[PDB]
PDB file of C-alpha atoms in Angstrom:
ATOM      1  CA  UNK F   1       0.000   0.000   0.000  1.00 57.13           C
ATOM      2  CA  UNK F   2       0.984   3.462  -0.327  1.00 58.09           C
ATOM      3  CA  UNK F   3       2.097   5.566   2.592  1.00 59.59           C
ATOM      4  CA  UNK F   4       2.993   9.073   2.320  1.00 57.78           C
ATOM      5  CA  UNK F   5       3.913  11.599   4.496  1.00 56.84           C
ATOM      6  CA  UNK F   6       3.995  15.470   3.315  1.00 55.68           C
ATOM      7  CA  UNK F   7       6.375  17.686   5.232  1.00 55.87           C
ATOM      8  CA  UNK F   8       5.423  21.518   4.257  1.00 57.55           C
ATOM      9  CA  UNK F   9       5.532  24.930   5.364  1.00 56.02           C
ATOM     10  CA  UNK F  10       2.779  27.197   5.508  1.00 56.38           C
ATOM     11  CA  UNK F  11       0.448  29.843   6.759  1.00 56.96           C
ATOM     12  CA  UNK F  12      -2.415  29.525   8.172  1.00 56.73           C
ATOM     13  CA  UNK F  13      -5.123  26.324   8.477  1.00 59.87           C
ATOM     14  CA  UNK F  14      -4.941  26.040  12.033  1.00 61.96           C
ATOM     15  CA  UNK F  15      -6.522  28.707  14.059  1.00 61.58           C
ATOM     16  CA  UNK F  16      -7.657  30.084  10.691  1.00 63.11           C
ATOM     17  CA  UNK F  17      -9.405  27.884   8.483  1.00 64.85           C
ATOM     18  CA  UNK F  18     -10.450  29.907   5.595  1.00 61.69           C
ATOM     19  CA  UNK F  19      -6.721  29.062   3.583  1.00 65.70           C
ATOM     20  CA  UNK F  20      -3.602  27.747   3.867  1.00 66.17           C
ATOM     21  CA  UNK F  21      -0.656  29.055   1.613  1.00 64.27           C
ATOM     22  CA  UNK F  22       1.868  26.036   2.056  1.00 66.43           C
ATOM     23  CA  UNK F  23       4.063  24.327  -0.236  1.00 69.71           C
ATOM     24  CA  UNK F  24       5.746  21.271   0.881  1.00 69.90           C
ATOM     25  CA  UNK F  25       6.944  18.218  -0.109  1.00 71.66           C
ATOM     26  CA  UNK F  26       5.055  14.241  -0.234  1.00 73.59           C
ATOM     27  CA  UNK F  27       7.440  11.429   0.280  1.00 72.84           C
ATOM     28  CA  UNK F  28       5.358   8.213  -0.533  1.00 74.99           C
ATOM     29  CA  UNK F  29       6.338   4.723  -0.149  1.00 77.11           C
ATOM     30  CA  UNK F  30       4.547   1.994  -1.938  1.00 76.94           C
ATOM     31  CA  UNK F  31       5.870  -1.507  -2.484  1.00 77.09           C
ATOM     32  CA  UNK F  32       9.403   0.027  -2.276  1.00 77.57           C
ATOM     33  CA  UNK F  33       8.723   2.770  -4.671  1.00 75.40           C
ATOM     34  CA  UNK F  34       9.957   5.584  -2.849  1.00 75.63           C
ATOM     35  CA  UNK F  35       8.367   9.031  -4.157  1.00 77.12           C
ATOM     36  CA  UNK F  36       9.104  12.641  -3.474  1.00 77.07           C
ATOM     37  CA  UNK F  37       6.272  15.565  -4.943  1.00 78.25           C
ATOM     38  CA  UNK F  38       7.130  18.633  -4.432  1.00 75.82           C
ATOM     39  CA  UNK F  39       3.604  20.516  -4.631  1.00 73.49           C
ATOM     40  CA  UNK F  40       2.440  23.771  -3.062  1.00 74.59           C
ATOM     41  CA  UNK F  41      -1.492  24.702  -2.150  1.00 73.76           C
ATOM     42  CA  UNK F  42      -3.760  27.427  -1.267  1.00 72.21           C
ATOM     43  CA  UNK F  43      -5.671  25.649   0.239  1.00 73.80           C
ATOM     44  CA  UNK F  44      -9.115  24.791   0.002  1.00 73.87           C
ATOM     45  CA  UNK F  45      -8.144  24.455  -3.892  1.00 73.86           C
ATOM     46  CA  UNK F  46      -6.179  21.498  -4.692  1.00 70.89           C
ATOM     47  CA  UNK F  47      -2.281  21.142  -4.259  1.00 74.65           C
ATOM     48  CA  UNK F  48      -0.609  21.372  -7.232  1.00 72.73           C
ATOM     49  CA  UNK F  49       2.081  19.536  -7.931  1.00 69.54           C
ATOM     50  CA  UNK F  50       5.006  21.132  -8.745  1.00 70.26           C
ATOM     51  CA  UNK F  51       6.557  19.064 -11.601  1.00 71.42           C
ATOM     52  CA  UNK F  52       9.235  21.151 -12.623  1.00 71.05           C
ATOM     53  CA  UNK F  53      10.742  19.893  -9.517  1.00 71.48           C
ATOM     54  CA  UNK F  54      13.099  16.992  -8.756  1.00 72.11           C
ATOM     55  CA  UNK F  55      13.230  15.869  -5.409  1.00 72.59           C
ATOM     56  CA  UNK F  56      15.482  12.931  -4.238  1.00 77.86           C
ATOM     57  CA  UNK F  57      16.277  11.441  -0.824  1.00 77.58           C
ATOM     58  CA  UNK F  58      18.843  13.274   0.911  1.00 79.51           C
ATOM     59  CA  UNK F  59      18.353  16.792  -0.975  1.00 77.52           C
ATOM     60  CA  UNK F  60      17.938  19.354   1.411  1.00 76.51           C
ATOM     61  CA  UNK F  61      14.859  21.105   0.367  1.00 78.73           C
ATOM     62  CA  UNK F  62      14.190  24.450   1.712  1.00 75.33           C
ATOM     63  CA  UNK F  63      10.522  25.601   1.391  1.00 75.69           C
ATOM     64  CA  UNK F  64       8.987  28.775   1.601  1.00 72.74           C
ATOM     65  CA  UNK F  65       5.234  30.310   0.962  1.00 74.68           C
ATOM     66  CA  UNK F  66       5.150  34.000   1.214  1.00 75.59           C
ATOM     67  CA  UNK F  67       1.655  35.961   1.383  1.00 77.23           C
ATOM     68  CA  UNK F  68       2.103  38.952  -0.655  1.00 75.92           C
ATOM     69  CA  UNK F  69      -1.208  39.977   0.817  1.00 76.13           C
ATOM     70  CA  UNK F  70      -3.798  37.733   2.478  1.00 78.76           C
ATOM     71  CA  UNK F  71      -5.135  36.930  -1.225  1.00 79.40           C
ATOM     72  CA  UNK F  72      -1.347  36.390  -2.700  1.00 77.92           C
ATOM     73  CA  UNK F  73       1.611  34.808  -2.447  1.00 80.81           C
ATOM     74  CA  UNK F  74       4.046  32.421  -3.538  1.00 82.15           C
ATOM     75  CA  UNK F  75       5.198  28.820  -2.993  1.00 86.03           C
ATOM     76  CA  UNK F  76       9.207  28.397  -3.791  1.00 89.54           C
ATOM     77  CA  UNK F  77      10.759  24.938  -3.418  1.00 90.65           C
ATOM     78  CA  UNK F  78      14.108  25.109  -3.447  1.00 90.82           C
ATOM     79  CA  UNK F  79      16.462  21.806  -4.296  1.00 93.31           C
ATOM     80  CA  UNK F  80      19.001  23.171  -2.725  1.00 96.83           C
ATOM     81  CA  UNK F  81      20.684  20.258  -3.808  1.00 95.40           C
ATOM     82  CA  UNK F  82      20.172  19.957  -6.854  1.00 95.90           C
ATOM     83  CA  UNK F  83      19.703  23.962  -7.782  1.00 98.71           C
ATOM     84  CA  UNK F  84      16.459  23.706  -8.688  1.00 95.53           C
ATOM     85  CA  UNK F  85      13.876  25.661  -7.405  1.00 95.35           C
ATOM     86  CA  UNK F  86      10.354  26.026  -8.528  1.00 93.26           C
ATOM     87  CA  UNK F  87       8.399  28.886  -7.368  1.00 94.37           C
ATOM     88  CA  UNK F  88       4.237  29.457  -7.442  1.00 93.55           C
ATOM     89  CA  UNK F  89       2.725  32.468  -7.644  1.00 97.04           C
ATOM     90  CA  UNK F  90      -1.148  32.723  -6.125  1.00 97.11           C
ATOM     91  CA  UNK F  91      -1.957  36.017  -7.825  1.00 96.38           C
ATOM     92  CA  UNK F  92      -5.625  36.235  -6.594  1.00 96.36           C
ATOM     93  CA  UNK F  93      -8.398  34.320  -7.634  1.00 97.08           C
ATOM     94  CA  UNK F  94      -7.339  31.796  -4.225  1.00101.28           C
ATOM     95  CA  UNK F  95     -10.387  29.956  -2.900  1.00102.76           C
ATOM     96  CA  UNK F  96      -9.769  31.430   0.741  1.00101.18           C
ATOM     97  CA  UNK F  97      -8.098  34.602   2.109  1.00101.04           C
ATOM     98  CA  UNK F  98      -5.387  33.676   4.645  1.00 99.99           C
ATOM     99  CA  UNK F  99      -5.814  34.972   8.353  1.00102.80           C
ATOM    100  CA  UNK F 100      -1.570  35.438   8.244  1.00106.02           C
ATOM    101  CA  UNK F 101      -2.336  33.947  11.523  1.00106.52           C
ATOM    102  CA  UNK F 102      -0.825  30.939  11.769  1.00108.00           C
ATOM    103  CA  UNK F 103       2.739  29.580  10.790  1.00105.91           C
ATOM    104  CA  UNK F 104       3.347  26.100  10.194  1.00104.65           C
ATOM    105  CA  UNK F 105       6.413  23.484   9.540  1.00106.59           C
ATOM    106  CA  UNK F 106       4.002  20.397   9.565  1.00103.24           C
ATOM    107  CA  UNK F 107       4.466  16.932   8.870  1.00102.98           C
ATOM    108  CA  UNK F 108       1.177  15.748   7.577  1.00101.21           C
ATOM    109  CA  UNK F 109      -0.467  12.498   6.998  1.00101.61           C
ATOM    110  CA  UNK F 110      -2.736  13.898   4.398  1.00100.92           C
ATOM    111  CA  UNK F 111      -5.654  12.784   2.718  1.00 99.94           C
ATOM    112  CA  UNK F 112      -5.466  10.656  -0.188  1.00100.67           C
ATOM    113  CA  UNK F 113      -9.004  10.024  -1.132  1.00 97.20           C
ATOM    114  CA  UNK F 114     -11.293   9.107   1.809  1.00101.64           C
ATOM    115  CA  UNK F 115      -8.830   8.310   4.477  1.00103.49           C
ATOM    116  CA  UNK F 116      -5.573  10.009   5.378  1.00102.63           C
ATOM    117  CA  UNK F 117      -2.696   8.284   3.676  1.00102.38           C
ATOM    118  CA  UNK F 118      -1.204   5.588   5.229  1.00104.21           C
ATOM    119  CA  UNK F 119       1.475   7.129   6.952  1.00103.32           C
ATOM    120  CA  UNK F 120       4.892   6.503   6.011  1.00105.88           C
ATOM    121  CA  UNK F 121       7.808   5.943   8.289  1.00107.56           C
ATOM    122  CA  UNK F 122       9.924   9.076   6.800  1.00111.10           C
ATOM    123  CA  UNK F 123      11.743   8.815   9.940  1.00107.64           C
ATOM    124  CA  UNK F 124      12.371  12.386  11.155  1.00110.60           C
ATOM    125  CA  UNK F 125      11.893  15.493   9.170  1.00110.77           C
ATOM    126  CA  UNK F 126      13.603  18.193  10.314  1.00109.53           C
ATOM    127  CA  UNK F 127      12.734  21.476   9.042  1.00108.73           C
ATOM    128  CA  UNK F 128      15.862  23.952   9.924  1.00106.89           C
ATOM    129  CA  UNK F 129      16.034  27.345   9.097  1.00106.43           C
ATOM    130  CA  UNK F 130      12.373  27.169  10.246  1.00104.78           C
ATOM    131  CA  UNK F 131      11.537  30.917  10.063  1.00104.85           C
ATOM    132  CA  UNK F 132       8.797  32.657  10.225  1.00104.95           C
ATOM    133  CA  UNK F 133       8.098  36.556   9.332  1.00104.54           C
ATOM    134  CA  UNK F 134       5.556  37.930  10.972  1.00104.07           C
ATOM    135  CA  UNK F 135       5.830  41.635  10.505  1.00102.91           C
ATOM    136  CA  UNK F 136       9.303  42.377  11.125  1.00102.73           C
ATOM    137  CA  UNK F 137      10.097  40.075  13.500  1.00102.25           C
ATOM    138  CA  UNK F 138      11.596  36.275  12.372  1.00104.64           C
ATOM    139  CA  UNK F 139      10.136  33.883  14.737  1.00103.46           C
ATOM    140  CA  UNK F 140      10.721  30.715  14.847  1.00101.17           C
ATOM    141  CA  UNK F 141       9.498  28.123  15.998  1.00105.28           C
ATOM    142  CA  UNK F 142      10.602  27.607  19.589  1.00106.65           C
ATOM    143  CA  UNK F 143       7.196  29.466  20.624  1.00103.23           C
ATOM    144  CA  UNK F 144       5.166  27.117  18.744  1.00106.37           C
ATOM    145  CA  UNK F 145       2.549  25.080  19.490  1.00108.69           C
ATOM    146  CA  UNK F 146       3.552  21.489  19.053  1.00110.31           C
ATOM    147  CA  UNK F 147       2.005  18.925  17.115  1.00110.10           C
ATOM    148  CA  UNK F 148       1.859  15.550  16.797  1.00106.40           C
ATOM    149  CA  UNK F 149      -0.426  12.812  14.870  1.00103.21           C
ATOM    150  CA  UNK F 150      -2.464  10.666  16.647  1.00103.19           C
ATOM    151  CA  UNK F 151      -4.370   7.763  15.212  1.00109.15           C
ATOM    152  CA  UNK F 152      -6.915   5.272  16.319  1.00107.78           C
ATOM    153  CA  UNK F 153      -4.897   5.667  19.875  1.00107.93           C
ATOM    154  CA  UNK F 154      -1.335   5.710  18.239  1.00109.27           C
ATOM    155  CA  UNK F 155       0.651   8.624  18.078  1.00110.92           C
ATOM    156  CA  UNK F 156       2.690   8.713  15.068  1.00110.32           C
ATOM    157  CA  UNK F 157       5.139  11.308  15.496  1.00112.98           C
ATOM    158  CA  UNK F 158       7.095  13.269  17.952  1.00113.61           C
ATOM    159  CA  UNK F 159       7.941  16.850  17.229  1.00114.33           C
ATOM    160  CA  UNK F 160      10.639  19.173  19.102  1.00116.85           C
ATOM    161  CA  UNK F 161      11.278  21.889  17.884  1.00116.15           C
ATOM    162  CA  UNK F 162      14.386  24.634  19.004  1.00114.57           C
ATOM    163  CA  UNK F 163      14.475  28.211  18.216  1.00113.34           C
ATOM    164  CA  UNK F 164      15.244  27.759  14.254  1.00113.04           C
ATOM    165  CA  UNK F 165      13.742  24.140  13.813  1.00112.42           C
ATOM    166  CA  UNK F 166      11.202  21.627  13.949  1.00113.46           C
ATOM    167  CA  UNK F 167      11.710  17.856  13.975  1.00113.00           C
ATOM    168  CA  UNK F 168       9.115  15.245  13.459  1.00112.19           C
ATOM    169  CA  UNK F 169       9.632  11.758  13.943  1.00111.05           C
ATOM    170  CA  UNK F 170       7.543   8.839  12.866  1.00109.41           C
ATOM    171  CA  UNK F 171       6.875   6.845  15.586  1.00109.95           C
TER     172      UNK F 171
ATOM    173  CA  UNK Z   1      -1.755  18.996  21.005  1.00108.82           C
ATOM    174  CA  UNK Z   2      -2.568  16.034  19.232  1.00109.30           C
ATOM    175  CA  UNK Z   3      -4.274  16.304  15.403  1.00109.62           C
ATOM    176  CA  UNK Z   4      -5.098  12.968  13.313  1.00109.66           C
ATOM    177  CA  UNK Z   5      -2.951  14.260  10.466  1.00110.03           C
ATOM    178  CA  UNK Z   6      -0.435  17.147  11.637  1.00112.04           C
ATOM    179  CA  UNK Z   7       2.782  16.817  13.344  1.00114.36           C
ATOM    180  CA  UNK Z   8       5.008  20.250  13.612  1.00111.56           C
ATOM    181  CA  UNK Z   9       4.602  23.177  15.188  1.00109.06           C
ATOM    182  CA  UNK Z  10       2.670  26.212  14.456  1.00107.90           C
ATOM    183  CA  UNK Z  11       3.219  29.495  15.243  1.00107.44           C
ATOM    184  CA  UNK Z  12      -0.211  31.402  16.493  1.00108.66           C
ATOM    185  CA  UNK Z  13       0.114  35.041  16.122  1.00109.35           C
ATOM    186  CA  UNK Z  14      -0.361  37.782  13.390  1.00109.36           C
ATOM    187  CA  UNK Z  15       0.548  38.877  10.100  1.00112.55           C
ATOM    188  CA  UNK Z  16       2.908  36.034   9.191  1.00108.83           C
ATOM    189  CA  UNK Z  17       3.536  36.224   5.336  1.00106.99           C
ATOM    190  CA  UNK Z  18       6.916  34.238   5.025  1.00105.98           C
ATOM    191  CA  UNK Z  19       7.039  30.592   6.768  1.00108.56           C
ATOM    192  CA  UNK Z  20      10.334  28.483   5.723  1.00110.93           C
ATOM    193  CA  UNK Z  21      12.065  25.747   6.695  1.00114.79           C
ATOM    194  CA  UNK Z  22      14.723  23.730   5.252  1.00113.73           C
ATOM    195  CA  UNK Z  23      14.409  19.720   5.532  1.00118.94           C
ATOM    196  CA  UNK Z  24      16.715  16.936   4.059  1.00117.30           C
ATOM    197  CA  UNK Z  25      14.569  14.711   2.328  1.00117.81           C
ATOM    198  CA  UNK Z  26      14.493  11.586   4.408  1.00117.14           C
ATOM    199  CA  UNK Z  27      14.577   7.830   3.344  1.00118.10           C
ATOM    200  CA  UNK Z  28      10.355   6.714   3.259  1.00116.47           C
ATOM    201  CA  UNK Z  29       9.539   3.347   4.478  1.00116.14           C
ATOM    202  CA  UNK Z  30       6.284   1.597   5.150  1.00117.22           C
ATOM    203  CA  UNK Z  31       5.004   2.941   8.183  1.00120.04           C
ATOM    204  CA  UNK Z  32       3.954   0.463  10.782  1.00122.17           C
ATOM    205  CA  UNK Z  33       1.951   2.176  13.409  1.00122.56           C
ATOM    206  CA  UNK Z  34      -1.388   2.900  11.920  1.00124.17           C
ATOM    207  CA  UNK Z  35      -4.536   0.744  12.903  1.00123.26           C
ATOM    208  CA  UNK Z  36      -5.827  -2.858  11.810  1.00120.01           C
ATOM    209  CA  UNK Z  37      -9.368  -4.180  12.843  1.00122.39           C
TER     210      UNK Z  37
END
């Protein structure tokens, strides 16, 4: 079976619920097919994948979403790696105005049709250089509020997170 | 704070418009915790 994880940045789509600018990244496992998607999302439309990047076990990926205005914004994943970067502009017409409220380095069993994705053992993710603006101040995310996946009784990750990072782990 | 599909942290506050964050892309394997039933 498939199991994914997604491991993204983004604003909003906790305390605010109306959109989430976030880009990130799906690693999938399925029958030792290993997958990485870059995609970004302004959420509630669809991710979009971002084809036009290549993302392989072991690059260091750093990904950003900006809000240009609650209503704009960009996804950028770079492959630091690999020097590839792929950037998204939302220029309007997104199906939900962010709050700019919330800022997120999430590890995310998402949804692949009617059930979350299995959830893949991606180990740890950690995002460093986890920065958020808010204003003029860089925060990151030492402040946060913590996060972890729970299922059917199971948690499925730990998180830590320091002043510039966040780790996951699968548990 | 425990979610059925989030793990990470996330920063409650006001007028964030840049989030980033920099992850190596880590070896997936099946997972194994999950439910059966």
């Amino acid at each position: 079976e498939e199991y994914c994880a997604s491991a993204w940045v983004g604003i909003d789509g906790d305390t605010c619920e109306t959109a989430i600018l976030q880009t990130g990244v799906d690693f999938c496992y399925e029958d030792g097919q290993t997958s990485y998607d870059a995609w970004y999302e302004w959420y509630p439309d669809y991710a979009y994948d971002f084809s036009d990047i290549t993302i392989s076990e072991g690059d260091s990926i750093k990904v950003t979403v900006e809000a240009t205005s609650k209503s704009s914004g960009s996804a950028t994943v770079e492959n630091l790696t690999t020097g590839q970067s792929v950037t998204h502009t939302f220029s309007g017409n997104v199906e939900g105005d962010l709050c700019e409220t919330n800022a997120e380095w999430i590890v995310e069993d998402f949804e692949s049709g009617d059930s979350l994705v299995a959830f893949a053992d991606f180990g740890s993710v950690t995002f460093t250089n986890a920065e958020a603006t808010s204003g003029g101040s860089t925060v990151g995310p030492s402040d946060a509020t913590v996060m972890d996946i729970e299922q059917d009784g199971s948690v499925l990750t730990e998180t830590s997170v320091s002043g510039d990072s966040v780790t996951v782990t699968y548990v | 704070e425990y979610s059925s599909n989030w793990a990470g942290a996330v920063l409650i506050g006001d007028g964030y418009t840049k989030v980033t964050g920099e992850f190596t892309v880590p070896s997936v394997s099946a997972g194994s915790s999950g439910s059966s039933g």
